[PDB]
Amino acid sequence: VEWTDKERSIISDIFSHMDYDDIGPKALSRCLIVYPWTQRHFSGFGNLYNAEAIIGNANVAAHGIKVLHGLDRGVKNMDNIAATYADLSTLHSEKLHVDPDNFKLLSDCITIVLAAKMGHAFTAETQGAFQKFLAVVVSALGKQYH
Amino acid sequence: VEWTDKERSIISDIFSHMDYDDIGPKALSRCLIVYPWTQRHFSGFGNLYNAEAIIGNANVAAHGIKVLHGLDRGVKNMDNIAATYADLSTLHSEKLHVDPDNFKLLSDCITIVLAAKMGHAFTAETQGAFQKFLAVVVSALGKQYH
Amino acid sequence: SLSDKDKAAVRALWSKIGKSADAIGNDALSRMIVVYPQTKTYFSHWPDVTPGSPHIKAHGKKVMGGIALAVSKIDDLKTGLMELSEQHAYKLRVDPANFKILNHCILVVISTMFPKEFTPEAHVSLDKFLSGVALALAERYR
Amino acid sequence: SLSDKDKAAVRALWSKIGKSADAIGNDALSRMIVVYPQTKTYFSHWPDVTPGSPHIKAHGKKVMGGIALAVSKIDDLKTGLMELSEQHAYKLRVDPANFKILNHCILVVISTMFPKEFTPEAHVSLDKFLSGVALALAERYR
Ligand code: HEM
Ligand code: HEM
Ligand code: HEM
Ligand code: HEM
Incomplete structure (x- = not known):
């Protein structure tokens, strides 16, 4: 739909109590560790040798923060989501060539990291709005590559 | 893009030399046989006992013909694809609840059946336009359910 | 394909998590019906199919009993869950995609509850395990 | 998970198809780069990466040599393709999704060429086989 x-309420509530600094680093780290093919695209980042090298890598942390900050822009623009992401879209699909399945992998990681930070507050209804x-x-x- | x-040329060419009667029955049959969970949704169709029961089932044949006839409408309307399929969309996603992965399964079957009918004429370029x-x-x- | 440390890993976690298996099952099954309502038709014969529901609670108990069963049979998921596969993949003709779903919901419910035990490392092996479950359950399709 | 008739099936077909393995590999690899151009970056170090290309032709020969290898090792895909898995899943870090792609392209090239041998029945077992290949090749990820 x-x-x-x-939903507007919930989504704005989640993003306004969110710690970008904590959540971002953690969602990306985990994505790189649970779905390790993903690291192919983060080559310039450096030491990705194993799980603890990734968790403490500052390049990864700062970049996790930027995925979140990119989510924030669609929060601000719920009725114009496809044009706000055009630029992003283009970078991920034609400059970078990231299979789209990967976007879904990163997402599941953000949910998982958010579920653990929110505990029982992360209700079925709150999970639904967020997904x-x-x-x-x-x-x-x-969107544009198909 | x-x-x-x-592409317009190729797609119209493929659909104008196509035998709905031959291709439709075959793509559906094959889909029901290679990805058998699919049959859950074709319950009213009857004898689906095994591969030969499916190949000769007339309910399946006639319905394969209708998937093709539904493709034909988007052929006629290449610039207004999402509104032409709205109705279809709604039936498949909220009345019927078909995981969207299944649409991709049926498609691969249509390509496969078309590749064998066209032989070497089914070029990489023709495959690309069609996919x-x-x-x-x-x-x-x-589209609408997410 | 589960390594020796993957098995160890699944086991040490199930050892910690296990006490709450029923809570996990109920919670996981309610999230599934509520966030992926395409899955409500498999349970359409039950009177009440809402997060409260006694139906949901009893069967969440059963599903988690199937996860315990698989922890036990982790050396051969394929023969250990052959009965479950017969019913899901062959009788119920459950769309394979729903297993990715239910699996995701389980992982979310565990993050909810045991945030501290649910490390990235545990995450990797539980994920290879849930994927092996799914593959094992997919045995009787074709 | 390949049954005895799945193995028989893959074998009888490879027995018919096999003569043209090189033609199949070249054709399959060209369709992949042309219809799913997201896959061209893995071969970006080759000079010419177009359907003609001598590069494409040599390596199509190699890929199909990997399919022959797997027909031989069909009783244990996992240990039979462990070297290939090391390179693809671990060194090249090839996105798992590309294997569904390449697999689809192979099936299309075979329909093209052996329309009559490529029955629905053959289709089912070749598909369980290509999926088992993919899973075997996915062994060294995590
Ligand atoms: C999942 C939803 C995602 C969102 C919202 C997102 C957002 C972003 C943003 C905002 C940037 C920075 C743009 C700039 O500074 O110019 C970026 C860069 C990037 N993203 Fe994503 N991304 C997502 C998923 C993915 C996935 C799944 C991958 C898998 C590899 C990925 C790979 C990359 C890469 C390689 C870069 C550039 C890194 C660099 O060159 O420094 N992204 N992304
Ligand atoms: C793949 C692209 C598809 C197209 C273009 C398509 C098109 C159609 C059309 C045109 C109808 C008939 C509408 C009417 O007569 O009112 C139909 C019915 C139906 N489709 Fe599809 N379909 C597609 C995929 C699927 C898939 C993958 C499934 C998997 C189960 C599916 C399941 C159904 C069912 C159950 C019906 C109704 C059968 C009945 O109640 O007689 N469709 N579809
Ligand atoms: C993911 C791992 C899963 C496990 C371990 C599992 C386990 C079980 C178990 C133990 C039963 C037992 C009841 C009996 O013995 O009759 C069962 C039944 C059932 N399962 Fe699952 N299942 C899984 C996934 C799924 C999914 C994803 C769906 C649907 C989307 C599903 C649909 C059903 C249905 C409809 C029943 C029958 C319940 C009834 O008739 O009242 N299962 N499952
Ligand atoms: C689907 C079954 C596949 C099989 C049987 C297969 C088989 C092979 C074989 C035998 C080689 C050998 C060359 C050597 O020994 O160095 C190879 C190399 C390679 N494969 Fe595949 N592969 C498959 C899928 C894929 C996919 C889907 C991709 C990319 C999207 C890919 C990317 C590569 C690359 C980049 C190389 C190295 C070639 C070079 O450096 O010049 N493979 N593969």
Whole structure:
């Protein structure tokens, strides 16, 4: 569907209590560790030798923070998601050539990291609104290549 | 991307030399046989007991013909694909609840059946134009549920 | 394909997690029906199919009983879950895609509950394990 | 998971198909680069990466040599293709998704060429086989 008031509320609430600094580094790290083919694209980052090299890599941390900051822009623009991500889309699909399945992998990691930070507050309803948000943005990072 | 003159030509050419009667029955049959979970949705069809029961089932044949006839409408409307499939979309995603992965499974079967009918005429370039067409229509059967 | 440390790993975690298996099953199955409502038709014959629901609670208990069963049979997932595969992949004709779903929901419920035990390292092996479950359950399709 | 009739099936087909393995490899690899151009970066170090290309032709020969290798090792795909897995899944860090792609292209090239031998029945077992290949090749990721 298209946005409900209830969803707008929840999504803005999640993003306003979120610690980018904590969540970003953790979601990316985990993605690189659970789906290690992903590291092919983060070559310039350096020491990715094993799980602890990744967790403490500052290049990875700072870049995790930027994925989050990129989520934030669609939060601010819920009715114009596909044009806000056009530029991103183009970079990920034609400059970089990232299989679109990967966007879904990164997303699952953000949910997983958010679920552990929120504990029981991360309700089925809150999970639903959030997955909708990420679904819609994963469509926009891909969208143009098919 | 969006349509090239070259692609418009190819796609219209493929559909104008196509035998719906031969291809449709065969693509569906094969889909039901190679990805048998698919049969869950074709329950009213009847005897689906094994591969030869499916190949000769007339319910399946006639329905394969209708998937093709549904492709034909997007052929006629290349610039308005998402609104032409709205109705279809709704039936497949909210009345029926077909995982979207399945649309991609049916597609691969249509390509495979078309490749064998066309032989060497089914060039890499012709394969490319056709997969673009099906990609775009698979986006429209899903599109609204996410 | 589970290594010796993958098995060890799944086992040490199940050892910590296990106490709450019923809570995990109920919670995981409710998230599935609520966030991926395409999955509600498999349980459409139950009266109440909402997160409260006694139906949801009993069967969450059963699913997690299937995960315990698989921890036990981790050396041969294929023959250990052959009965479950017969029913899901062959009788119920459950779309394979739903297993990725349910699996994701389980991982989310565990992050919820045991945030500290659910490390990235544990995450990798539980994921190879849930994928091996899914593959084992896919045995009777074709 | 390949049954005895799945193995028989793959073998009877490879027995018919086999003569043209090089033609199949070249053709399959050209379709891949042309219809799924996201895959061209893995071969970006080659001068000419177009359907003609001598590069494409030599390596199509090699890939199909890997399929022959797997027909031989069909009782244990996992240990039979461990070297290939090391290189693809571990050194090249090839995205797993590309294997579904290449596999699809191979099936299309075979329909092209042996329309009559490529039955639905053959189709099922070749598909379980290409999936087992992919899984075997995925061994060294994590
Ligand atoms: C999943 C949703 C994603 C979002 C919202 C996102 C967002 C972003 C943003 C905002 C940037 C920085 C743009 C700039 O500074 O110019 C970026 C860069 C990048 N992203 Fe993503 N990304 C996502 C998924 C992925 C995935 C799954 C991959 C897998 C490899 C990936 C690979 C890359 C790479 C390689 C770069 C550039 C790194 C560099 O060259 O420094 N992204 N992404
Ligand atoms: C792949 C692209 C597809 C196209 C273009 C397509 C098109 C159609 C069309 C045109 C109809 C008939 C509409 C009517 O007469 O009112 C239909 C019905 C149906 N389709 Fe599809 N379909 C596709 C994929 C799928 C897939 C993958 C499934 C998997 C189960 C599926 C399941 C169904 C079912 C269950 C029906 C209704 C059968 C009945 O109730 O008689 N479709 N589809
Ligand atoms: C993911 C791992 C899964 C495990 C371990 C699992 C385990 C089980 C178990 C132990 C039963 C037992 C009830 C009996 O013995 O009759 C069962 C039944 C059932 N399963 Fe699952 N399952 C899984 C996934 C799925 C998925 C993803 C779906 C649907 C989307 C599903 C649909 C069903 C249904 C409809 C039943 C029958 C319940 C009834 O008739 O009341 N299963 N499953
Ligand atoms: C699908 C089954 C596949 C098989 C049987 C296979 C087989 C092979 C074989 C035998 C080699 C040998 C060359 C050597 O020994 O160095 C090779 C190399 C290679 N493979 Fe594959 N492969 C498969 C899929 C893929 C995919 C899908 C991709 C990329 C999208 C890929 C990328 C590569 C690359 C980049 C090389 C190195 C060639 C070079 O450096 O010049 N492979 N593969």
